[PDB]
Structure 1
Amino acid sequence: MIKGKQGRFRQNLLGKRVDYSGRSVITVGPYLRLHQCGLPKKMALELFKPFIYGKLELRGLATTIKAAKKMVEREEAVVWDILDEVIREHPVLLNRAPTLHRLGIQAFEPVLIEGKAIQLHPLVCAAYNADFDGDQMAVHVPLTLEAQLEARALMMSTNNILSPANGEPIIVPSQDVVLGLYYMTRDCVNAKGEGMVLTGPKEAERLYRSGLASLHARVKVRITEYEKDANGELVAKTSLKDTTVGRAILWMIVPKGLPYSIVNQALGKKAISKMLNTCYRILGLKPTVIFADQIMYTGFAYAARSGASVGIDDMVIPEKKHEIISEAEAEVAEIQEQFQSGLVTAGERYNKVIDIWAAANDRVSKAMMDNLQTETVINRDGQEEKQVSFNSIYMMADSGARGSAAQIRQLAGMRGLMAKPDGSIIETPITANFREGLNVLQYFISTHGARKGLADTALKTANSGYLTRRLVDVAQDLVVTEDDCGTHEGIMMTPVIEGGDVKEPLRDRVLGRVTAEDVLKPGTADILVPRNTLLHEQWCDLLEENSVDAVKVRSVVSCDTDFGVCAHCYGRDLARGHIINKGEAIGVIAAQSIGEPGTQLTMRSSIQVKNKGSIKLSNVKSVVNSSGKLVITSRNTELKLIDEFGRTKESYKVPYGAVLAKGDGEQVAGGETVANWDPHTMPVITEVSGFVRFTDMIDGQTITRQTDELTGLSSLV
C-alpha cells in the first residue's frame, strides 16, 4: 500500500485530484490579447457556481441556497450578466499534460465564448509546445485572495517572456507571422511604383492600399528615428532613407526608441527574435509586449494577403540530376569490374562505392539548391537581371518558418543513402525524390528507417521522464537564503576551445555573474572592474574591448552559506534583468531546465595552423634534434596561436615526441604546417648524443637474436 506508484506517497499524498477543474480541447482564436484566453459559457458557469450563489444572495434575487441552485440550474437570463460581473478580474490557470518546465502552466484572464473549446493566444503555444492536432488542456481556478494575487503578480502570461534556462526570449513569432513578415520585407528588382519618393510611412500605407504600388519596391522615404543616448531622453532625428515600401509600412508599429536599421533587412526568424530581445533590453517590458501583439496582428494580415500557396510546379527538379546519376553509376561499374578481376578487395570496393555515392549526392543537392534559390531572372527596365527567387518552397525554407535544407533536398533531389537495421549503410542509395514516386524497395527501406526513429522517440521520452524525476528529487531542498557569504574563492571562467575555434566566447560564460577578485586590464596594475560587481552587458563590452582571457568569478559550489547560498555566489536571476531575490528555490528551476531538453537528444597527423600570429607553447620539456627542429618529451604540451594584440586565438594539443619547425614565440603564416608526428608506434627517443651500449642484455634469457631477415640489419629483441 506504500511502495510503487500506487503507494499512498506517490498516488494520493504527493499528487491528488482537485475540485474546481475543467478539461477541454484548445483552438487559436488569434484575435485575443496576450493576457487573456477564451472560455466556454458552460464550463465557466459550472466552475464559478459558489461565486454566483454569493452574488445572487447579495443582489437578493435568491434568499436561500436551494432557490439559487434552481435559478442557476435553469440559467435565467440574469445569471449570465452576473457571470460576466464575477469574471471581471478573476484569473484562472491553464495546464498541459506533459508539463516539463516551469512555463508548462500559466495564469490568464478569461473571456467568455459561445463555444465548447478553450481558445488560446497563439504565441504561448511555443511555450506550451502545444500543437492543435487535438491536444487537450486542463483548467483550474484560484479560490482565495492570496491565490489570485499570486497568479496576477507571478503567473500572468505577460510576466514570463524569457526562458529561465537562458535569457533568450520565449515568445518568438513561431511559424506563420514570421513568413508574413519575411515576405513583407523583400524587394523585387522592378515592381509597380518604383523609384518614387514618399513623405512618411502613412503615405506608403495609403499608396499600397490604393494599389498604386507593389507591396515591396525600392523607394526613398523620410522617417524619424528616436535615439535615447541622452539620460533617458528620446532625441528625435529625421532622415531620408531608401528602403522598400513594405518595410516602411512595418516601421509604423515599432516603438519609439529603436534604430531604423533593425527593420531594414529581409527579417528572418532570427532577426525577429533578436529584435524582440533588444526591444525588451532597452524599453523595458510593456512596450515589448504591446509591440509583440501588433507584430502578430500585422504578420497575420499580410501573410494572408500574400496568398503564398504551394503547388506541384514549385518542386523544380534540377535538369542535370539524371546526367550526374548516370555518371556516378558508370563510375560504380568500373569499381565493380576491378573487384570482379580481384584487383581490389571487397571492403575497399564497398568504401569507395559509398564515397562516390556521397559525392554524387552532394553534387545533386548543390545543383538543385543553386538552380532554385536564384532562378528568378527579370528585366530591370534595362535588359535583364537576376535575384533571389520567390518559389514558395524556398521562401518558406529560407525564412525559417518550416524545414531545413534537408527536407527540400529530399523533396527535389535524391534522398541520399539509407541505413539498414544493424547500422550498416546500403551500398545502393535511394536515387528518387518525392516529386517522383519511389518504387517498392526504396519505400521499404525508408519505412524501416522511419520505424526505427519512432521506436527510439518512444523509448527516449520514457527514459527521460525517469531521469528528470530523479534529478528534481535530489535538489529540491535548496533555497537561496542569504545575501552575501563573504568569501573570495571562485573559478577561472575562460572561453572554451576544442582544439578548433572558440566553441563559446567568454562573454556568454560570465554574463550575469558577480566577480570574485577585480580584474586588471592588460595595462597591468589597472583596476578595470571592482571585485564584487555584477557583470551586466556594459561591463561585458568593456571586457571584450579589453580582450580579457579568463576571470575569477564567484561560483555556487563554494558558497559559505549553510543550508543555502548567499545571493552574490549565485548571480543574476536569468528570469529577469537584476540580481536574484532572497528566497528563490533555484534548485528546482535548475533541475527543470536541465531535464526538459532531454527529449530532443539522441539515445543510441600534422598541425596546420591557419592564421598569422605569434606561436606560444606551454609545458615544454623539449630538445633540438639532428635536423635543428624541436622534439618534445612532455605529454600535456599545448600550442597556442595568439594574435598581435596578445589574446589567445587558437589552441591545439601537442602529441608526445612530435617534430616542430619553430621554437617558442615565433611568427607563423596562415596555412603553415608547424608540427608532425607518427600516430602509430612508440619509440625509445633519447636526449643526448653518444654511444649506446647493450647493458644487461644476454642472448638466451634476456634478449633473442631475432635479426631482421628481409633486409639484414642487426636486430635483437
Structure 2
Amino acid sequence: TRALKRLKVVSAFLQTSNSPKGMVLDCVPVIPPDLRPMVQLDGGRFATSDLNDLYRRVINRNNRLKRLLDLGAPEIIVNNEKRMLQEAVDALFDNGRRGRPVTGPGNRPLKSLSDMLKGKQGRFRQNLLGKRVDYSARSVIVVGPQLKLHQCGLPKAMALELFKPFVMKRLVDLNHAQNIKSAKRMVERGRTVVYDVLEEVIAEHPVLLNRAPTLHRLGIQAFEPQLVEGKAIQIHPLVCTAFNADFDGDQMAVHLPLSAEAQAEARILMLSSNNILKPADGRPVTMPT
C-alpha cells in the first residue's frame, strides 16, 4: 500500500512533460496592485489589504539576506535569515499551516493568498457562484386576496427605482422631458408626470419574486406586476406555501428580467400559473388550507 500511494504521485510526473522542480520556487510572483488596494479612506485614514504586509515581509527578509551574503557572515546568522525567509513565504501562500500564524496587529490572523480561495466566504462560493445584482429590490409582503394567480402588487416607489432606464426612455419619446439628463432629474424629484408614464411601461413585463431560503425550484416565481400604493409587496394567498411565506414579517426580493430571451423565460417557464403541481410527487401545491 505504501508503494501504491507513492506510485500515484510519481507516475503523474513521468507521463506529464512538466518536471518535478516546480516544488522549489525561485521567484515569487506578486498580485497586481488593484487586487490589493491601498485605498484612501474618508477622514484622512487609510485602508490596506493584508497581502501588502505579507509581501512586505518577504521583500524585507530577502533584501537582508543579500546584505548578509555579501559581507562575510557566519553560518549561524545566515541560516537564521534563510529560515526566516522560508517562513515568510509560507505565511504568504497559506497562513497557519505551520505553527502560529503571523497575527500582525495581534487582534486577528492576517489574510493569505489561499484564504481568499477557501471556505464559504472564499472567491468560489461568494463571488463566482452567487453574486449581488443590479435591477433588484426588497420589501415586506402582505396578503392580497383580490389578485389573480398571475399577479402581484408592486409598490410605486419600488417599481420606479427598478424601471428607471425604461421610464427615462419613454419620457423623452413622449416629449415630457427634453433630454436624458432632464429626464433623470424629473424621476429623481418624483414629479407628477412620471407616474402616468410609469404605468404605461411596466405592463406585460414580468418580475421574479423570491424568498430567502429558496429550498426548491418553486422558490422563484415570475408574476405580472401591478402598481399599488403603500410600501409592501402584495402577494397572492394561494402561492404562499410554495414560497413557505407567512405574513408575520417576511421580506421578499424582487428581480427584473431585462433582455428579450430572459423575459420570455419568465412568461413561459417561470410563471406562477404554469406551476400548479409540486415536482416532487405531482401533488397540488397552490390550494393551501
Regarding TM over 0.5, the answer is: yes
**Counterpart residue identity of residue 94, structure 1:** L
Structure 1 ranges of 4+ moved more than 2 A: 60-63
Q: Take 2:212 and 2:118, find their aligned partners in 1: how far apart are those partners?
A: 24
**Counterpart residue identity of residue 171, structure 2:** L
Counterpart position of 1:134:
249
Find out whether 1:68 has 2:194 as its counterpart. no
1:412-561, aligned counterparts within 5 Å?
none
Find out whether 1:115 has 2:247 as its counterpart. no
Q: Take 2:191 and 2:248, find their aligned partners in 1: how far apart are those partners?
A: 36
Residue from 33, 39, 44 that aligns with 2:154: 39
Tell me the TM-score normalized by structure 2.
Answer: 0.59
Residue deviations 1:569-610 (CA, integer Å, cap 9, x gap): xxxxxxxxxxxxxxxxxxxxxxxxxxxxxxxxxxxxxxxxxx
| Alpha carbons 2:176, 2:193 under 8 Å: kept | no
Find out whether 1:29 has 2:144 as its counterpart. yes
Q: CA deviation at 1:145?
A: 1.1
Q: CA deviation at 1:77?
A: 1.6
Q: RCO higher in 1 or 2 (8 Å CA, sep ≥ 6)?
A: 2
Counterpart position of 2:205:
90
The 3-state SS of whatever aligns with 2:214 is coil
Counterpart position of 2:262:
147
Counterpart position of 2:135:
20
Q: Take 1:82 and 1:62, find their aligned partners in 2: how far apart are those partners?
A: 11
Counterpart position of 1:156:
271
The 3-state SS of whatever aligns with 1:155 is coil
Q: CA deviation at 1:126?
A: 1.0
**Counterpart residue identity of residue 129, structure 2:** L
The 3-state SS of whatever aligns with 1:159 is coil
**Counterpart residue identity of residue 110, structure 1:** P
Q: Take 1:61 and 1:113, find their aligned partners in 2: how far apart are those partners?
A: 24
Q: Take 1:135 and 1:88, find their aligned partners in 2: how far apart are those partners?
A: 26
Find out whether 1:57 has 2:179 as its counterpart. no
Q: Take 1:61 and 1:122, find their aligned partners in 2: how far apart are those partners?
A: 39
Counterpart position of 2:284:
169
**Counterpart residue identity of residue 17, structure 1:** R
**Counterpart residue identity of residue 144, structure 1:** S
The 3-state SS of whatever aligns with 1:123 is helix
Q: CA deviation at 1:62?
A: 2.3
Q: CA deviation at 1:59?
A: 1.4
1:522-601, aligned counterparts within 5 Å?
none
Q: CA deviation at 1:9?
A: 0.6
Q: CA deviation at 1:39?
A: 1.0
| Aligned residue-pair number | 174
Name structure 1 gaps, 5 residues minimum.
176-717
Find out whether 1:101 has 2:231 as its counterpart. no
Residue deviations 1:605-626 (CA, integer Å, cap 9, x gap): xxxxxxxxxxxxxxxxxxxxxx
Counterpart position of 2:122:
7
Residue deviations 1:103-154 (CA, integer Å, cap 9, x gap): 0110001111111100100000011111111111000001111111110010
Q: CA deviation at 1:73?
A: 1.6
**Counterpart residue identity of residue 93, structure 1:** L
- Which of the two has greater helix per residue? 2
Residue deviations 1:536-585 (CA, integer Å, cap 9, x gap): xxxxxxxxxxxxxxxxxxxxxxxxxxxxxxxxxxxxxxxxxxxxxxxxxx
Q: CA deviation at 1:74?
A: 1.9
Residue deviations 1:83-117 (CA, integer Å, cap 9, x gap): 00001111000000000001011000111111110
Q: Take 1:150 and 1:12, find their aligned partners in 2: how far apart are those partners?
A: 25
Q: Take 1:165 and 1:23, find their aligned partners in 2: how far apart are those partners?
A: 29
Q: CA deviation at 1:167?
A: 1.4
Q: Take 2:136 and 2:153, find their aligned partners in 1: how far apart are those partners?
A: 16
Q: CA deviation at 1:5?
A: 1.1
Q: CA deviation at 1:20?
A: 0.8
Tell me the TM-score normalized by structure 1.
Answer: 0.24
Larger of the two Rg values belongs to structure: 1
Q: CA deviation at 1:60?
A: 2.4
